[PDB]
Symmetry: D4
Subunit: 221 residues, 8 copies
């Protein structure tokens, strides 16, 4: 199981910061891309990511996950549609440029959508006056200068097994703010006070390196 | 006061959903852009955002804010530098493509920096396995489908003035998670338990429309 | 109610041979297209037919039909999807370039697809030796030099109402070779001999101009 | 005896679906085309198909057939002219974009013309209202989902030799709709009832795999 | 009756030095050509000279003559074919780039071919050693600096009517070297000594302007 | 000694039909040109013909002749200027686009100018009415179908040495029309009746292959 | 007497900073240049500066001076040649890119040559080590921070008329470093100690605005 | 230690006249640059000199100097900033196009700036009338035909150590016109009469080669 990236932008370069060590195949039609992809220590596959026979050429079936990021949403959607006809199980992460098309990328079959231009534009217009939101996003989601965001799983037979959010007191015990809990494909933001934790649940929250460290300790029993 | 936009992408289009009805002047060299900018109900100024004389031609001095989003960070930086030479007061929001260049846009004189490709790429790599963080960002920062992030100010003569975060009990009172407090240019994420609120402080948090309303009530009168 | 054409090619031009006298609106982004479109006696709408806001600008909702034929299947698919989110009733006729994408075009929401490239290329390989098929296609489906394909509806109170296909004996009476009968969205090619006609049925036949005239009379009053 | 293809499009790619296994020379001047051609399993000769020296380089002389599909009818007509100047015998199959030029493709020398854009354009305009015709052509000339078009010869000493059309009663005996009969270079569509079959005639008809198979038996032995 | 020019090169600008005073319509697709064509006191028609409807648009039927000079031979031919399809009578002067195609221009329907590239290439290799031929062509066919080639008609009731070439003694009486004599469509280069002149014959030969005036006088009245 | 060719048109390719078997080097900057240049059996030198160091690179000093035919007159002139700067003796044959620049190539330092565009334009305007001149240029200077122009040298101790033009009676003895006589750098078109031939003079005239052969014999031995 | 400028660059723009107030015609091929030229307050003529007819359209004849700065030395040379055909008197100032062509620009007819790329590259290579030379040129010929270069003429009835270099002792009297002396068309840098001044001689020297001011005083009255 | 050059122009070509034989590495993104750079005897690094990772790859750290001259002031500035973030010691020589940006190039960290466009344009306006200045610049800074600009160090134990400019009398002794004295980073143009020389001072003068040679000897041992 390996990672396939369709298209190449700064996004997919930043993506290879955390996959550089894993076998990554980049599928793009432009030749000039070969140089850049090999600069990042990834495999390059020359072909058209909108063509079904070329998606297979890059082992899309049986692959760990596919990241789609082409030059228009038109191409991005069409590429997704191709993957779903090749393998309906493989995880698809795709970038959406236009807001209109977030819905389309999902209906094409993308598992998770990323809308960086929708965010950017929204953060711009809000930050005209103040935009403390903007510098939050910049410092937590972009730079992670002091704080980071974490997905921590509750392991089987955890200390928090069957413990309500109220009793768990996660924020004061560990320092991490609890944003929400994830089960399956579903995230419950700001969970009810008496929600009960299970093994396999995902805790999502903001915290510094140490507060995160305390969190991981606080969970295994 | 009016808003000047340098360059044109989907970001700046998405940006105009919120200023649509305000005096917005878009400065770009490409002729094809006039067509789209007039489609969005904004003014068009034909010039080179990197040339100082064209920046003045677009009323950058004494403008409310300038948003900089050009085709490369090279240009973005060069544009900012031109603005800082016309007016060192005017608020500058700029989007950075490469990570290495976030530091540079600040040194050039940008007030708030946005890094959509840094976020996008980082979200991509971590969402290969799970990515509940990814769908959080998607549903609150991008789509605002159920929840939203808010900046509410503490009015002069507030009910919460001189009251600590522990005493304020804002989470249990209103439903809104308090992420941080802004004073001046400084955002304090997860503020000290005994931190004292002042008039003019900005509350940054996540909430549903109703939970937001209860917060607005909870401050004034 | 009018016809909207997304994109411009020789197909969409040949299409105006039969609507030449109707309000046809052509939506395309390339400026060069205007000149050609106005030489055809057609309305031109400048815009991106993959952008929902531009499709609506072209009065796609409540139009007679939308013809989609863009530079790539990628865009053609995307366009269809956008139309389908503006109006799910409007009839969509779309041209597929690649074979793999005929079924993508239907699953996007096009009511009728055409694969001129697939027909053409398949016909090529088959005409290397003989190819009486190719000259059938050319002389009947392209030039209509002597014979034509016809769709003739069986009107209310028709002479043929409730008459069996063998009993009707249309080929020997009229001259027209009956290929199939259409009801609703379903075409029964070579219908069983004991099939009954109803008012509303469509007869699909090959025939000479006089032979077709003879059919129109044998049906009504 | 081998096949020469001048120009590269989705049509010529679809051609090699049926030619894969035989010796094909593809002549175009774009280099990008080498890649797609060798992964299609054909020989590639880089050069200008409108230039006679390059056509000769591509073994047009004494080829089984030459298929011409260039970017404009200008080039396609010029190409055919060249081929006829090298070899006036070789079967020329050429694709006409514009209607006006179908007449010219023949006058230049092409033995059979295909006009995909003309067919497509006409099917579009017709299918606005109903278009059961479109879905016939789609499901028999393109997809061959249930029915196909056949060209079966009458072999030497066949059961049907010297038998009249009415006497042969082919539709009822076999299930196949007889469209026409080919003698020499001409197709007689809907032949007279008393037409006599000869060894060497070609039957052009519509039928399913079983009906087709029944037809081949019905003639020989 | 008026002159129609397809395409635009330096040739066609030089052609206009002697029609400037007549109505000339240049038919080209390039917008840039408009500026140049109006700088010569010539009319501009915007259109595709290989498309028959654009050819008709520019009054090709009933035009005095059509000059065809397009960007490739492929086109020049296609253009000529279109003109011949509108009017089989109209005089066609066509410029030929490749030698291969001098034949094809004539078969397409050109009344006179000009092959400046062929002439030029031959003069090049020829003039490496000597090329006295080269400076003749330069000084008589290009510059006409002292001499020039003449076409002079023999008027009705001419002093030369019925006089043989020997008896007429033209070179010695007038100074004009006779190259040939034209009747109908036939050009006799170096006419035999006993060739008899007729009213309507064209004398073709080289001469200074005084030698030409001498000939004019020597034939008429 | 060898031929150096700056630039590449159909002119230069035609030029090579007569040198094919000589070491000819084509100096051009374009990569596409390599293909075509090696397709004619010529050598490719990659350089900028207007850059003197690249000019030297291609053995311009001490080369038999240099043929200049670049894409604009600005370039052609420039080139000629470098070659003259590298060597004032070397034979330069140069093609002229605009009439304005025939003077400029000669002053730049070209030995013989060819102006096919000027010739072709004049022949166009001329041939609207008649143009028997046109078909002469076509059949004698371009195609040489039955006649051609010759340059025949008078050998040392020729039978014509010291014989006058009248006494030589060349036309009547040989069949060749004499146009002019070449001495040194000077061409005397239509030489006076009493011009005395010398060993080294060049007879320039039009003739059939047999008429030319007759002349060669008539002069020597 | 007005100024014609051929071609547009930052140079010709920097030029108009000192000319704005006088009649300037700018001749350029590119349309985009119009807006920037009228923003600079000079007349713009659209046309080909390498063509005589267009140069005449731009009023080169009897202009005060013509400045030539086209995109290649090729064009600049051709351009100058054209001007010299129109007016052999007009002062031609031209900019040389390549060093090899400075000699060509003069031989073409340019009165003064400026070689900014040659000065630049030369200053780049020297300054690797020290480069106090680089900062002199920058601070005197470019920025004129504290000092600049002067050309003060010696008027009729001059105090210095007939006085020698040693006796005039110009540096000690005025602070101005005497660089050279202009007589006719020729500058004598660092003249003999006993050189005697004349009215109309031009002094070329380096100085501050006060030092320069004293020199003007020092000469007249 | 070696020299790194970012971007390529005739400036950087002229630069290699003085380092031709030294290890020069040229960093540019355009493939086409490769061939030109290797014709100059320099090394080519393929990369984007605005990307920090690519400046690193070019060994910018600890290089002798870095010369920046890119397509636009935007890119030139970005480059300098990248270098200063890699090494804040390395000497940066950069070329500025626009006047506004000379300010910026230094503020980005360039040790020495050159503005060939500013000089050139300034000289143009100045030289419309006379311009002996321009011919100083041309013949001394550009061509160096008779006289050169020089930087000579006063070595340790110099004859001139601690001698004033009045007492040194360098102009009358050696013939070189003393312009300024350089110490550290500062140039004192036209130094005071009684300025004392020190070991390590740089003398900036204008001299003939013998004049300069005479200075080198007057200065040592």
């Amino acid at each position: 199981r390996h990672v396939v990236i369709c298209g190449w932008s700064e996004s997919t370069l930043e993506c290879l910061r955390e996959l550089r060590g894993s076998e990554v195949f980049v599928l793009a039609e432009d030749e000039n891309v070969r140089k850049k992809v090999l600069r990042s220590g990834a495999n390059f596959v020359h072909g058209d990511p909108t063509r079904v026979s070329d998606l297979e050429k890059a082992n899309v079936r049986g692959a760990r996950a596919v990241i789609v990021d082409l030059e228009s949403d038109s191409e991005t959607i069409h590429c997704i549609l191709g993957i779903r006809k090749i393998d309906e199980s493989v995880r698809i992460i795709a970038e959406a440029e236009r807001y209109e098309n977030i819905e389309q990328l999902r209906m094409a079959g993308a598992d998770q959508v990323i809308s960086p231009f929708v965010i950017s534009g929204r953060l711009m217009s809000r930050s005209i006056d103040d935009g403390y939101e903007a510098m939050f996003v910049q410092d937590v989601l972009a730079e992670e200068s002091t704080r980071r965001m974490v997905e921590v799983p509750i392991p089987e037979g955890s200390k928090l097994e069957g413990v309500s959010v109220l009793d768990a007191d996660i924020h004061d015990v560990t320092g991490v703010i609890i944003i929400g809990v994830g089960r399956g494909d579903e995230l419950i933001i700001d969970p009810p006070r008496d929600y009960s934790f299970r093994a396999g649940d995902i805790i999502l929250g903001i915290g510094k390196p140490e507060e995160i460290e305390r969190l991981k300790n606080y969970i295994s029993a």
